[PDB]
Ligand binder design. Structure first.
Ligand SMILES: CCCCCCCCCCCCCCCC(=O)O
Length: 264
């Protein structure tokens, strides 16, 4: 048997050389630059059928695990489930992530490593699900213009962009996007983020991926802050926020994807 093959989309934010080293297939989400405005698009079921069949062929049909952006942020999952039903029962297993970014990238790396040791599809599936259940995703927005126009803030969350404050920490819970702090300076926002991750760590080492979009310096300052505050033996990785997501986060955005010892 050939190892199970792992596929994510670009929203997972895996660095290119990591995806390459671990043989994780990356499919890019769409950015349309037409006229002045940028917009984005999920993956169609047709592109996923092609992408999955190609990984099945390559892995001698011993299984594909697919990990895509949350079904509440994108039509991708819905396309993935349609493409997966085109193959024999359980050739393609679609993880229902309720997440995006390196919480998903992390689940994919754990699944790829297990696949490498000959783990079955079900077993790679379980590792991926367990990594996600123990993750959190926070985002610092340096401005709220692009998040507001994205359609991913429910009106229950904020009826008017004013309700977001000016530099909030956002968090994903149950797939959906929430305000974790109505902060107004980067300093206060970072301090609060560090606070939340620290509580959530609960004295145990954490794995952390810090994402940035045009915020290289800021992401460095935040990492430094998190190093001092998080339990000893925590590890830190840097990633670039997928340009598809950067369309909706705006410039200056910094994300923290964390995997913890325990459940929430
Ligand atoms: C931890 C990752 C960084 C956070 C990125 C900012 C918030 C992104 C909001 C969702 C946009 C999803 C666009 C996906 C493509 C699409 O379906 O059109």
């Amino acid at each position: 048997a050939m190892p199970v093959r792992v596929i994510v989309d670009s929203s997972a934010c895996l660095p290119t050389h990591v995806a390459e080293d671990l043989d994780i297939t990356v499919i890019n989400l769409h950015v349309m630059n037409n006229g002045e405005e940028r917009s984005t698009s999920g993956l169609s079921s047709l592109e996923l059928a092609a992408s999955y069949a190609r990984q099945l062929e390559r892995g001698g049909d011993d299984g594909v695990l697919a990990l895509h952006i949350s079904k509440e942020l994108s039509s991708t999952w819905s396309a993935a489930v349609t493409a997966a039903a085109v193959f024999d029962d359980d050739s393609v297993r679609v993880v229902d992530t309720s997440s995006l970014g390196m919480a998903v990238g992390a689940a994919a790396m754990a699944a790829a490593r297990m696949a490498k040791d000959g783990a079955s599809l079900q077993e790679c599936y379980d590792i991926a699900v367990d990594t996600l259940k123990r993750s959190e995703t926070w985002i610092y927005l340096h401005r709220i213009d692009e998040i507001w126009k994205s359609g991913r803030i429910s009106t229950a969350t904020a009826m008017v962009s004013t309700a977001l404050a000016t530099r909030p920490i956002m968090r994903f819970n149950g797939g959906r996007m929430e305000i974790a702090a109505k902060t107004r300076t980067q300093s206060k926002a970072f301090a609060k983020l560090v606070e939340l991750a620290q509580i959530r760590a609960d004295g145990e080492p954490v794995f952390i991926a810090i994402g940035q979009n045009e915020a290289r310096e800021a992401a460095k300052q935040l990492e430094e802050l998190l190093r001092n505050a998080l339990p000893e033996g925590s590890s830190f990785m840097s990633v670039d926020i997928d340009p598809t997501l950067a369309v909706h986060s705006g410039p200056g955005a910094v994300s923290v994807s964390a995997v913890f010892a325990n459940q929430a």
